[PDB]
Amino acid sequence: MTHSMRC
Amino acid sequence: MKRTWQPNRRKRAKTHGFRARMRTPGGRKVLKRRRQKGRWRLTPAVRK
Amino acid sequence: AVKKFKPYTPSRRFMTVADFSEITKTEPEKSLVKPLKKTGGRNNQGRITVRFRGGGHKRLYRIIDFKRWDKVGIPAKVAAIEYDPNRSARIALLHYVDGEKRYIIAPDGLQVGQQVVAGPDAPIQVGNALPLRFIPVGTVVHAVELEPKKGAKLARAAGTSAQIQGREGDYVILRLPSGELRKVHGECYATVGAVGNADHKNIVLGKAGRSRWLGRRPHVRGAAMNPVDHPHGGGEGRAPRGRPPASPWGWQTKGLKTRKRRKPSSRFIIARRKK
RNA sequence: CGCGGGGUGGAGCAGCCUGGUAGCUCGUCGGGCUCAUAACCCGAAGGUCGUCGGUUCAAAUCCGGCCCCCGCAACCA
RNA sequence: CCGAGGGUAGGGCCCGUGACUGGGGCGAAGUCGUAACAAGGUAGCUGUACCGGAAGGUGCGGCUGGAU
RNA sequence: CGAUGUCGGCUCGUCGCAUCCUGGGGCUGAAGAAGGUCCCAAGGGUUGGGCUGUUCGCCCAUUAAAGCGGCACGCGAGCUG
RNA sequence: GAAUGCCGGCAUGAGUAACGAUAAAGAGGGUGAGAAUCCCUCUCGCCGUAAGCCCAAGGGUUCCUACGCAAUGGUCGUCAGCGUAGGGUUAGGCGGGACCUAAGGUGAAGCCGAAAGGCGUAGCCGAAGGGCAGCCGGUUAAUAUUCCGGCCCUUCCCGCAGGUGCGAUGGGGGGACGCUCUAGGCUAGGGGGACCGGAGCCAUGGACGAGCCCGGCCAGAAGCGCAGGGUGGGAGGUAGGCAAAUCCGCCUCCCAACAAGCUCUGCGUGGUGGGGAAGCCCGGGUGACAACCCCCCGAAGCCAGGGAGCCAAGAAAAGCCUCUAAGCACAACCUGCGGGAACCCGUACCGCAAACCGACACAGGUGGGCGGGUGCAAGAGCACUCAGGCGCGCGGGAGAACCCUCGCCAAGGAACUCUGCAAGUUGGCCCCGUAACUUCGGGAGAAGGGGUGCUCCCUGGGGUGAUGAGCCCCGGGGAGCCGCAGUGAACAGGCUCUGGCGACUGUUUACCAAAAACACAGCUCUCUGCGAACUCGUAAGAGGAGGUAUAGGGAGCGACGCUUGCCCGGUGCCGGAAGGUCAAGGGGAGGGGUGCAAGCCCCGAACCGAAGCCCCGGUGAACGGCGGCCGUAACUAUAACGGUCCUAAGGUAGCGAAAUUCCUUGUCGGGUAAGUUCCGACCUGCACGAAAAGCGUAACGACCGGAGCGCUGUCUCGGCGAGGGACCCGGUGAAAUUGAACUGGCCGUGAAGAUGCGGCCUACCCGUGGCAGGACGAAAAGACCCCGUGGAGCUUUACUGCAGCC
RNA sequence: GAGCUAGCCCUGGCCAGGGUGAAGCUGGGGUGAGACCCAGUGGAGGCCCGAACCGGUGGGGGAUGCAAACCCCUCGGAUGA
RNA sequence: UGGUUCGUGGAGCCAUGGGGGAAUCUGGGCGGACCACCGCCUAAGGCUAAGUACUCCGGGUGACCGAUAGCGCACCAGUAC
Ligand SMILES: [K+]
Ligand SMILES: [Mg+2]
Ligand SMILES: [Mg+2]
Ligand SMILES: [Mg+2]
Ligand SMILES: [Mg+2]
Ligand SMILES: [Mg+2]
Ligand SMILES: [Mg+2]
Ligand SMILES: [Mg+2]
Ligand SMILES: [Mg+2]
Ligand SMILES: [Mg+2]
Ligand SMILES: [Mg+2]
Ligand SMILES: [Mg+2]
Ligand SMILES: [Mg+2]
Ligand SMILES: [Mg+2]
Ligand SMILES: [Mg+2]
Ligand SMILES: [Mg+2]
Ligand SMILES: [Mg+2]
Ligand SMILES: [Mg+2]
Ligand SMILES: [Mg+2]
Ligand SMILES: [Mg+2]
Ligand SMILES: [Mg+2]
Ligand SMILES: [Mg+2]
Ligand SMILES: [Mg+2]
Ligand SMILES: [Mg+2]
Ligand SMILES: [Mg+2]
Ligand SMILES: [Mg+2]
Ligand SMILES: [Mg+2]
Ligand SMILES: [Mg+2]
Ligand SMILES: [Mg+2]
Ligand SMILES: [Mg+2]
Ligand SMILES: [Mg+2]
Ligand SMILES: [Mg+2]
Ligand SMILES: [Mg+2]
Ligand SMILES: [Mg+2]
Ligand SMILES: [Mg+2]
Ligand SMILES: [Mg+2]
Ligand SMILES: [Mg+2]
Ligand SMILES: [Mg+2]
Ligand SMILES: [Mg+2]
Ligand SMILES: [Mg+2]
Ligand SMILES: [Mg+2]
Ligand SMILES: [Mg+2]
Ligand SMILES: [Mg+2]
Ligand SMILES: [Mg+2]
Ligand SMILES: [Mg+2]
Ligand SMILES: [Mg+2]
Ligand SMILES: [Mg+2]
Ligand SMILES: [Mg+2]
Ligand SMILES: [Mg+2]
Ligand SMILES: [Mg+2]
Ligand SMILES: [Mg+2]
Ligand SMILES: [Mg+2]
Ligand SMILES: [Mg+2]
Ligand SMILES: [Mg+2]
Ligand SMILES: [Mg+2]
Ligand SMILES: [Mg+2]
Ligand SMILES: [Mg+2]
Ligand SMILES: [Mg+2]
Ligand SMILES: [Mg+2]
Ligand SMILES: [Mg+2]
Ligand SMILES: [Mg+2]
Ligand SMILES: [Mg+2]
Ligand SMILES: [Mg+2]
Ligand SMILES: [Mg+2]
Ligand SMILES: [Mg+2]
Ligand SMILES: [Mg+2]
Ligand SMILES: [Mg+2]
Ligand SMILES: [Mg+2]
Ligand SMILES: [Mg+2]
Ligand SMILES: [Mg+2]
Ligand SMILES: [Mg+2]
Ligand SMILES: [Mg+2]
Ligand SMILES: [Mg+2]
Ligand SMILES: [Mg+2]
Ligand SMILES: [Mg+2]
Ligand SMILES: [Mg+2]
Ligand SMILES: [Mg+2]
Ligand SMILES: [Mg+2]
Ligand SMILES: [Mg+2]
Ligand SMILES: [Mg+2]
Ligand SMILES: [Mg+2]
Ligand SMILES: [Mg+2]
Ligand SMILES: [Mg+2]
Ligand SMILES: [Mg+2]
Ligand SMILES: [Mg+2]
Ligand SMILES: [Mg+2]
Ligand SMILES: [Mg+2]
Ligand SMILES: [Mg+2]
Ligand SMILES: [Mg+2]
Ligand SMILES: [Mg+2]
Ligand SMILES: [Mg+2]
Ligand SMILES: [Mg+2]
Ligand SMILES: [Mg+2]
Ligand SMILES: [Mg+2]
Ligand SMILES: [Mg+2]
Ligand SMILES: [Mg+2]
Ligand SMILES: [Mg+2]
Ligand SMILES: [Mg+2]
Ligand SMILES: [Mg+2]
Ligand SMILES: [Mg+2]
Ligand SMILES: [Mg+2]
Ligand SMILES: [Mg+2]
Ligand SMILES: [Mg+2]
Ligand SMILES: [Mg+2]
Ligand SMILES: [Mg+2]
Ligand SMILES: [Mg+2]
Ligand SMILES: [Mg+2]
Ligand SMILES: [Mg+2]
Ligand SMILES: [Mg+2]
Ligand SMILES: [Mg+2]
Ligand SMILES: [Mg+2]
Ligand SMILES: [Mg+2]
Ligand SMILES: [Mg+2]
Ligand SMILES: [Mg+2]
Ligand SMILES: [Mg+2]
Ligand SMILES: [Mg+2]
Ligand SMILES: [Mg+2]
Ligand SMILES: [Mg+2]
Ligand SMILES: [Mg+2]
Ligand SMILES: [Mg+2]
Ligand SMILES: [Mg+2]
Ligand SMILES: [Mg+2]
Ligand SMILES: [Mg+2]
Ligand SMILES: [Mg+2]
Ligand SMILES: [Mg+2]
Ligand SMILES: [Mg+2]
Ligand SMILES: [Mg+2]
Ligand SMILES: [Mg+2]
Ligand SMILES: [Mg+2]
Ligand SMILES: [Mg+2]
Ligand SMILES: [Mg+2]
Ligand SMILES: [Mg+2]
Ligand SMILES: [Mg+2]
Ligand SMILES: [Mg+2]
Ligand SMILES: [Mg+2]
Ligand SMILES: [Mg+2]
Ligand SMILES: [Mg+2]
Ligand SMILES: [Mg+2]
Ligand SMILES: [Mg+2]
Ligand SMILES: [Mg+2]
Ligand SMILES: [Mg+2]
Ligand SMILES: [Mg+2]
Ligand SMILES: [Mg+2]
Ligand SMILES: [Mg+2]
Ligand SMILES: [Mg+2]
Ligand SMILES: [Mg+2]
Ligand SMILES: [Mg+2]
Ligand SMILES: [Mg+2]
Ligand SMILES: [Mg+2]
Ligand SMILES: [Mg+2]
Ligand SMILES: [Mg+2]
Ligand SMILES: [Mg+2]
Ligand SMILES: [Mg+2]
Ligand SMILES: [Mg+2]
Ligand SMILES: [Mg+2]
Ligand SMILES: [Mg+2]
Ligand SMILES: [Mg+2]
Ligand SMILES: [Mg+2]
Ligand SMILES: [Mg+2]
Ligand SMILES: [Mg+2]
Ligand SMILES: [Mg+2]
Ligand SMILES: [Mg+2]
Ligand SMILES: [Mg+2]
Ligand SMILES: [Mg+2]
Ligand SMILES: [Mg+2]
Ligand SMILES: [Mg+2]
Ligand SMILES: [Mg+2]
Ligand SMILES: [Mg+2]
Ligand SMILES: [Mg+2]
Ligand SMILES: [Mg+2]
Ligand SMILES: [Mg+2]
Ligand SMILES: [Mg+2]
Ligand SMILES: [Mg+2]
Ligand SMILES: [Mg+2]
Ligand SMILES: [Mg+2]
Ligand SMILES: [Mg+2]
Ligand SMILES: [Mg+2]
Ligand SMILES: [Mg+2]
Ligand SMILES: [Mg+2]
Ligand SMILES: [Mg+2]
Ligand SMILES: [Mg+2]
Ligand SMILES: [Mg+2]
Ligand SMILES: [Mg+2]
Ligand SMILES: [Mg+2]
Ligand SMILES: [Mg+2]
Ligand SMILES: [Mg+2]
Ligand SMILES: [Mg+2]
Ligand SMILES: [Mg+2]
Ligand SMILES: [Mg+2]
Ligand SMILES: [Mg+2]
Ligand SMILES: [Mg+2]
Ligand SMILES: [Mg+2]
Ligand SMILES: [Mg+2]
Ligand SMILES: [Mg+2]
Ligand SMILES: [Mg+2]
Ligand SMILES: [Mg+2]
Ligand SMILES: [Mg+2]
Ligand SMILES: [Mg+2]
Ligand SMILES: [Mg+2]
Ligand SMILES: [Mg+2]
Ligand SMILES: [Mg+2]
Ligand SMILES: [Mg+2]
Ligand SMILES: [Mg+2]
Ligand SMILES: [Mg+2]
Ligand SMILES: [Mg+2]
Ligand SMILES: [Mg+2]
Ligand SMILES: [Mg+2]
Ligand SMILES: [Mg+2]
Ligand SMILES: [Mg+2]
Ligand SMILES: [Mg+2]
Ligand SMILES: [Mg+2]
Ligand SMILES: [Mg+2]
Ligand SMILES: [Mg+2]
Ligand SMILES: [Mg+2]
Ligand SMILES: [Mg+2]
Ligand SMILES: [Mg+2]
Ligand SMILES: [Mg+2]
Ligand SMILES: [Mg+2]
Ligand SMILES: [Mg+2]
Ligand SMILES: [Mg+2]
Ligand SMILES: [Mg+2]
Ligand SMILES: [Mg+2]
Ligand SMILES: [Mg+2]
Ligand SMILES: [Mg+2]
Ligand SMILES: [Mg+2]
Ligand SMILES: [Mg+2]
Ligand SMILES: [Mg+2]
Ligand SMILES: [Mg+2]
Ligand SMILES: [Mg+2]
Ligand SMILES: [Mg+2]
Ligand SMILES: [Mg+2]
Ligand SMILES: [Mg+2]
Ligand SMILES: [Mg+2]
Ligand SMILES: [Mg+2]
Ligand SMILES: [Mg+2]
Ligand SMILES: [Mg+2]
Ligand SMILES: [Mg+2]
Ligand SMILES: [Mg+2]
Ligand SMILES: [Mg+2]
Ligand SMILES: [Mg+2]
Ligand SMILES: [Mg+2]
Ligand SMILES: [Mg+2]
Ligand SMILES: [Mg+2]
Ligand SMILES: [Mg+2]
Ligand SMILES: [Mg+2]
Ligand SMILES: [Mg+2]
Ligand SMILES: [Mg+2]
Ligand SMILES: [Mg+2]
Ligand SMILES: [Mg+2]
Ligand SMILES: [Mg+2]
Ligand SMILES: [Mg+2]
Ligand SMILES: [Mg+2]
Ligand SMILES: [Mg+2]
Ligand SMILES: [Mg+2]
Ligand SMILES: [Mg+2]
Ligand SMILES: [Mg+2]
Ligand SMILES: [Mg+2]
Ligand SMILES: [Mg+2]
Ligand SMILES: [Mg+2]
Ligand SMILES: [Mg+2]
Ligand SMILES: [Mg+2]
């Protein structure tokens, strides 16, 4: 599961 | 699915066997170490 | 006379095959074949040392007579011309009046039923082997030994030849298939005529699978790789070379000369190759 | 008030660095050649150097402010 | 059953029209050069080919409808 | 920063009023009809589509009207991606 | 007392989720302390190219039987792959070894390496490849090609007889080979029979019948028959097959040659030996003296080392046959016959799975053979069924929301949405018919349409047989009948127009990317004369290649079409016996230390002195790069034209708001009621452009864009219905999380978002089914960001080394 | 450690059925001879449709799973690299 | 080049991969570049107890542990897994 990206 | 362990008696004996170990400087050190540690089995069991 | 096909598949549109017209015997001489051990380009370490090799059709090696000074003076009849998968040339089966049989590379124009002979006194006819000194200047020749008694080394591929340009001392001057001008010792044997099957170079493989049949695995460009792999590897998007074009091992590959400088054979090479 | 370069006869460019000197090509003006125009030949005129202020005995030139004209940058989110 | 015709679908020919585009004709006094007519100042013309703001230039071969 | 998931949409609402409509008004350069402007008023209502991820906006067809803002740019242990 | 500390114990969540494919169960009888769950019987359902049967791996007693049920079994348990005990695996012919060799491994000779060790021809090892002698039936609770029975066969030893120049690890032959297609004749297997054998049956309206139902074979030596495979015979010469050779090879001659002859298989027959159903009665008995026969279909199997065609050109060695050498010809070998001899290991059971690989009795993974019948054009597809095997090791009710999988839907028909995502539609076969474009193959199943069942009658060809009948395979014509509907169920394309990209079939990030990426034929440059270049290795030795410039390495580009312009000043590479610089070394002008001196010792200029660098040239499908300002035409505008500065040279053709355009939804045109997307144009191209190729291109694509038709529950806009869950009762019973808790709302306050502080409001105690706003809810010591004189991968004209090369 | 995975080497095995109909061959036409055209025969192909087998396109489910990558529907290849 | 305290240092000594290459006591090496003087020692063959190190094994002894300690193991442990 791709981690959430706060980028 | 296809897992990694796919047993094969001939493969086992020719790869980890007593005679494979003895043929080689590192393999003899394996035997030397497992004797010093007191292993009941110096080499993997395979029925042949 | 390379053969074409009608475009009934996308690959048959371009494929061409050799016409096999000169061939007169479709199975080899059992006593003259032996197994050709395929390598896949791997050396005695098991390491790939020539990339992209393997997986081609199984072949039997045909023993070829590259000496012919072996049987001086003994004539032979040309029994057949056969396909050989181990080389581009066709090959000729010889029946010596001895009863001995042998294969040679089939020169252009050689005819089934004619005779051939080797030696210092042989006539100057297509298919005959003489020492180089006894062959007249101007003669087109193939299967040339490069040193006496060491075996034919030069001009062996389909269609090739050398031409005798002149003499000097114990040596004759040859123009090799590459155009190089070279001194070859006069006692070196050579065979009169050019190698045959000269249409070989016009075959169009036509499809990727054909290269696979020949044992040629796909070749991948350095520019398609990563910096771990290759000087041309990496870059965002496509990328030019960005440095002098190089091999996988980093040496330059556009012009950089590679013949060893102090090689003894330089005293015997008159003029480097042409075109 | 992110960064850089530029402004000097009519046009396009030197001179600045290294203070005291304004230069080159074309254009323009007078004359000549030709029936005549152009080309060509012989002469000449025209720039106080974007502006202000300072330094200096002296500023196109060195330093600062302003005006204008280009060019570059603006990423991680 | 055939059957005017209606419907569905796919073709053929012709006309009109279309952002834009190609060249053509014509138009008293526009800009550039001067290719041709004199050996027109490199004889011209010519089929082809390549090139050039433009007429044109050059290569190859051909013609005299070229002069001296 | 030993983690407060970050745009838009969908769903579901709820609130403020600087009010888009409907209701009540004063002034008008309000004849009538229709407007303009300001005051009171938040009870209810405030459409369907083309384009774009879009918020917004432009356009089509309507409408009494096609309001503007807050709720972690409301709402991912509710969905979407 | 804290370290997301360590080890152990025990809580919470909670009687909660779950109990592992939605193939499915019901009853009667029995056993037992106890039974939905074990046994038996009837009924029902599921698989049936398997979910049945047989091998090989792997597993290792799980096999069979008696006794058991604490634990294991997701419930239960009397049952079990579980516990205890006893029993069980039988070979000259099956498989492997006392036979052969393959890759590869090992390795006398030999080569190399500080040591360890690395190589290496022969030879040896190495098999699911070669070679080699057993078929059918019976028997056990459990093994059987193994025991037994019947009929066959192999090697070794010895002997007798006959024959022969006998004799080998040496010579030779043979063994011995691909892919696709395929002939004849057979077998396996299957269908039908009004014929043969059989316990019986007549029901509920009819049938005592050419009725129904069941079965109608298997193995076999010599001999014979059919069909195939393999093979020329004789003589003369002979210098080749590393000795010899009567063999083999070559040459010559004569004969035999779509033959024959000899030889070897397959199939049939065959003395004989077996088997033998339904049904009924109790695995057995009976049937039964069972019958065992005709017709058809027919292999991918057999004859086989068969035939043809093609290019990519298709193992070895032994067995075997032949030749001869030492030798020996009292021997020896060949043939026949007789007697004797014949060892070791495996054999149980599971084996697409509860016994193997996945921690589990796990919806996953696991190679080879058999795999029946009917219909559907065919088939291993699909539906139903045989043999055989199962109902998936928790159940009983209920008939809420909600979820999953499924069915239908009025009117509308993409209005849904990023997107027709999803789901409809279409759907097989036969006939009719079919566009642009095109590389002439194709595009094409283009599109679009018609037919499709059953009955009677006439009739065509092919196979079998006989040339007939019967059987069998493809049809053709006419007349009818029925329904809403005839590929009536199941399996089975939605279509079109138009752009971008990539020519194409292929390949890829095992497990978030399948693509426009990689590869690809093809094009070009460049290196390489062979002990090649290049690659791996300290080396020896290998690969390259048993190849040789039409070949091999490296690099870019990427079918094909039309093309690929200008710059060589910088970097690269290539060429250049001059010159400049240049290390060790040579040289030794000239000094110095010390010694009484002979001397010993040290420093040292000119000059000679490689590669490299400088220098001079060449070179672009080498790295790369391809301009600015100002002015000018008789309307305006715009500039073909001119001026000047600069450059190594100033972007040619083609293309262009683009997979590239910032301003931008550029502007105009098309399509739409309306179009930031799309398509066609324009060109002030922020920032295309010619092998990091430019512009096109038929065909191709689970790629990405835009449109239309068809059709729809996508939507207006939801409704109903099915089953598996959810819910209730009986059985078994987790989890992350958790400082403790007696845990409300508002308005404030507080480290700035309060159940916990203030003030006020509200509120009896405790659950069950639900929803997710909050507990800055769980999970993971933020993967973004910074910081650390932290780490790692990668680059280069950063530094400094090293290999390698000069 | 290559019993997973990647490549190569050796030796074996597997790919139902249907469709399209290249070359060649034969014959006919054609010509001075030809090229060539027509028909029949033929059975080619990184050809077509589709099981096994090999894949993993789109969606849904699953997410303390049946499963540390599975299931359903759909979809690619299927004589070949 | 290594060794030594000696990292090129005035760098000797001891060892030696490369080149060159003697002499037999009036021969040769050393005393930290080198020279003289003065001294020390006899290279290019080999052997040699004891005093020294260790603890698999045996014993003796602890202001050593006392079953989460002490060895990983007090127990059928280098076992189960
Ligand atoms: K970042
Ligand atoms: Mg795998
Ligand atoms: Mg698999
Ligand atoms: Mg395996
Ligand atoms: Mg094995
Ligand atoms: Mg095995
Ligand atoms: Mg193995
Ligand atoms: Mg090994
Ligand atoms: Mg071994
Ligand atoms: Mg050792
Ligand atoms: Mg033991
Ligand atoms: Mg071991
Ligand atoms: Mg072709
Ligand atoms: Mg063609
Ligand atoms: Mg040929
Ligand atoms: Mg051989
Ligand atoms: Mg080797
Ligand atoms: Mg290579
Ligand atoms: Mg290779
Ligand atoms: Mg070759
Ligand atoms: Mg050949
Ligand atoms: Mg020579
Ligand atoms: Mg080629
Ligand atoms: Mg090949
Ligand atoms: Mg290639
Ligand atoms: Mg490539
Ligand atoms: Mg790359
Ligand atoms: Mg890459
Ligand atoms: Mg690597
Ligand atoms: Mg690199
Ligand atoms: Mg690069
Ligand atoms: Mg790249
Ligand atoms: Mg780029
Ligand atoms: Mg890349
Ligand atoms: Mg690019
Ligand atoms: Mg490039
Ligand atoms: Mg570059
Ligand atoms: Mg380079
Ligand atoms: Mg030589
Ligand atoms: Mg050369
Ligand atoms: Mg400031
Ligand atoms: Mg200056
Ligand atoms: Mg000055
Ligand atoms: Mg001036
Ligand atoms: Mg001045
Ligand atoms: Mg930046
Ligand atoms: Mg009508
Ligand atoms: Mg002219
Ligand atoms: Mg003129
Ligand atoms: Mg002129
Ligand atoms: Mg002229
Ligand atoms: Mg010119
Ligand atoms: Mg934070
Ligand atoms: Mg935490
Ligand atoms: Mg957290
Ligand atoms: Mg919606
Ligand atoms: Mg209101
Ligand atoms: Mg919008
Ligand atoms: Mg916003
Ligand atoms: Mg907007
Ligand atoms: Mg109104
Ligand atoms: Mg708002
Ligand atoms: Mg905000
Ligand atoms: Mg914001
Ligand atoms: Mg939100
Ligand atoms: Mg979410
Ligand atoms: Mg959201
Ligand atoms: Mg949340
Ligand atoms: Mg929530
Ligand atoms: Mg939350
Ligand atoms: Mg504390
Ligand atoms: Mg914890
Ligand atoms: Mg800790
Ligand atoms: Mg702990
Ligand atoms: Mg305990
Ligand atoms: Mg614990
Ligand atoms: Mg506990
Ligand atoms: Mg408690
Ligand atoms: Mg509890
Ligand atoms: Mg709960
Ligand atoms: Mg659960
Ligand atoms: Mg569960
Ligand atoms: Mg299922
Ligand atoms: Mg029951
Ligand atoms: Mg029970
Ligand atoms: Mg019970
Ligand atoms: Mg039972
Ligand atoms: Mg019953
Ligand atoms: Mg096991
Ligand atoms: Mg029990
Ligand atoms: Mg007990
Ligand atoms: Mg249990
Ligand atoms: Mg279980
Ligand atoms: Mg009991
Ligand atoms: Mg048993
Ligand atoms: Mg037996
Ligand atoms: Mg024996
Ligand atoms: Mg070694
Ligand atoms: Mg072995
Ligand atoms: Mg074998
Ligand atoms: Mg056997
Ligand atoms: Mg038998
Ligand atoms: Mg039997
Ligand atoms: Mg052969
Ligand atoms: Mg062979
Ligand atoms: Mg074989
Ligand atoms: Mg082939
Ligand atoms: Mg039979
Ligand atoms: Mg049948
Ligand atoms: Mg002879
Ligand atoms: Mg001779
Ligand atoms: Mg046979
Ligand atoms: Mg019986
Ligand atoms: Mg009886
Ligand atoms: Mg088969
Ligand atoms: Mg066969
Ligand atoms: Mg061999
Ligand atoms: Mg005798
Ligand atoms: Mg005999
Ligand atoms: Mg024995
Ligand atoms: Mg045994
Ligand atoms: Mg057995
Ligand atoms: Mg399976
Ligand atoms: Mg199987
Ligand atoms: Mg089982
Ligand atoms: Mg595991
Ligand atoms: Mg189970
Ligand atoms: Mg399973
Ligand atoms: Mg049957
Ligand atoms: Mg069918
Ligand atoms: Mg069940
Ligand atoms: Mg099942
Ligand atoms: Mg209920
Ligand atoms: Mg289901
Ligand atoms: Mg249903
Ligand atoms: Mg209905
Ligand atoms: Mg409806
Ligand atoms: Mg519609
Ligand atoms: Mg409609
Ligand atoms: Mg999408
Ligand atoms: Mg259908
Ligand atoms: Mg069309
Ligand atoms: Mg057409
Ligand atoms: Mg079209
Ligand atoms: Mg087209
Ligand atoms: Mg066509
Ligand atoms: Mg009909
Ligand atoms: Mg009917
Ligand atoms: Mg289809
Ligand atoms: Mg592609
Ligand atoms: Mg691609
Ligand atoms: Mg392309
Ligand atoms: Mg293309
Ligand atoms: Mg394919
Ligand atoms: Mg992936
Ligand atoms: Mg990945
Ligand atoms: Mg992974
Ligand atoms: Mg993983
Ligand atoms: Mg995926
Ligand atoms: Mg991708
Ligand atoms: Mg794909
Ligand atoms: Mg890729
Ligand atoms: Mg391609
Ligand atoms: Mg070494
Ligand atoms: Mg090789
Ligand atoms: Mg070789
Ligand atoms: Mg190309
Ligand atoms: Mg490519
Ligand atoms: Mg391509
Ligand atoms: Mg074209
Ligand atoms: Mg250059
Ligand atoms: Mg140059
Ligand atoms: Mg250059
Ligand atoms: Mg030099
Ligand atoms: Mg550059
Ligand atoms: Mg440059
Ligand atoms: Mg140009
Ligand atoms: Mg051009
Ligand atoms: Mg544009
Ligand atoms: Mg536009
Ligand atoms: Mg474009
Ligand atoms: Mg651009
Ligand atoms: Mg734009
Ligand atoms: Mg934009
Ligand atoms: Mg617009
Ligand atoms: Mg429009
Ligand atoms: Mg524009
Ligand atoms: Mg195209
Ligand atoms: Mg196309
Ligand atoms: Mg594709
Ligand atoms: Mg695709
Ligand atoms: Mg559409
Ligand atoms: Mg719905
Ligand atoms: Mg229900
Ligand atoms: Mg109750
Ligand atoms: Mg309970
Ligand atoms: Mg339990
Ligand atoms: Mg408390
Ligand atoms: Mg409390
Ligand atoms: Mg509470
Ligand atoms: Mg409360
Ligand atoms: Mg504060
Ligand atoms: Mg605050
Ligand atoms: Mg508060
Ligand atoms: Mg409270
Ligand atoms: Mg408190
Ligand atoms: Mg309190
Ligand atoms: Mg307080
Ligand atoms: Mg309080
Ligand atoms: Mg309070
Ligand atoms: Mg309250
Ligand atoms: Mg509750
Ligand atoms: Mg409850
Ligand atoms: Mg609840
Ligand atoms: Mg909540
Ligand atoms: Mg919350
Ligand atoms: Mg928190
Ligand atoms: Mg929260
Ligand atoms: Mg996580
Ligand atoms: Mg940490
Ligand atoms: Mg942190
Ligand atoms: Mg972290
Ligand atoms: Mg930061
Ligand atoms: Mg630092
Ligand atoms: Mg620091
Ligand atoms: Mg650091
Ligand atoms: Mg690092
Ligand atoms: Mg090199
Ligand atoms: Mg493997
Ligand atoms: Mg293996
Ligand atoms: Mg296939
Ligand atoms: Mg045909
Ligand atoms: Mg033909
Ligand atoms: Mg033929
Ligand atoms: Mg295909
Ligand atoms: Mg098809
Ligand atoms: Mg779907
Ligand atoms: Mg998962
Ligand atoms: Mg699945
Ligand atoms: Mg499916
Ligand atoms: Mg197929
Ligand atoms: Mg297919
Ligand atoms: Mg094939
Ligand atoms: Mg030292
Ligand atoms: Mg020293
Ligand atoms: Mg030395
Ligand atoms: Mg002395
Ligand atoms: Mg002396
Ligand atoms: Mg000494
Ligand atoms: Mg001393
Ligand atoms: Mg001394
Ligand atoms: Mg001494
Ligand atoms: Mg002593
Ligand atoms: Mg004590
Ligand atoms: Mg104590
Ligand atoms: Mg204890
Ligand atoms: Mg303790
Ligand atoms: Mg101990
Ligand atoms: Mg312990
Ligand atoms: Mg312990
Ligand atoms: Mg134990």
Short mmCIF file of all heavy atoms in Angstrom, two decimals, chain G residues 736:
data_model
loop_
_atom_site.label_atom_id
_atom_site.label_comp_id
_atom_site.label_asym_id
_atom_site.label_seq_id
_atom_site.Cartn_x
_atom_site.Cartn_y
_atom_site.Cartn_z
P A G 736 -3.17 -8.18 19.50
OP1 A G 736 -1.99 -9.07 19.63
OP2 A G 736 -4.10 -8.04 20.62
"O5'" A G 736 -2.69 -6.72 19.09
"C5'" A G 736 -1.95 -6.50 17.90
"C4'" A G 736 -2.57 -5.40 17.07
"O4'" A G 736 -3.91 -5.80 16.70
"C3'" A G 736 -2.75 -4.07 17.80
"O3'" A G 736 -1.58 -3.28 17.76
"C2'" A G 736 -3.94 -3.45 17.07
"O2'" A G 736 -3.52 -2.81 15.88
"C1'" A G 736 -4.77 -4.68 16.72
N9 A G 736 -5.84 -4.91 17.72
C8 A G 736 -5.66 -5.35 19.00
N7 A G 736 -6.77 -5.40 19.67
C5 A G 736 -7.75 -4.97 18.78
C6 A G 736 -9.14 -4.81 18.91
N6 A G 736 -9.82 -5.09 20.03
N1 A G 736 -9.82 -4.35 17.85
C2 A G 736 -9.14 -4.08 16.73
N3 A G 736 -7.83 -4.19 16.51
C4 A G 736 -7.18 -4.65 17.58
#
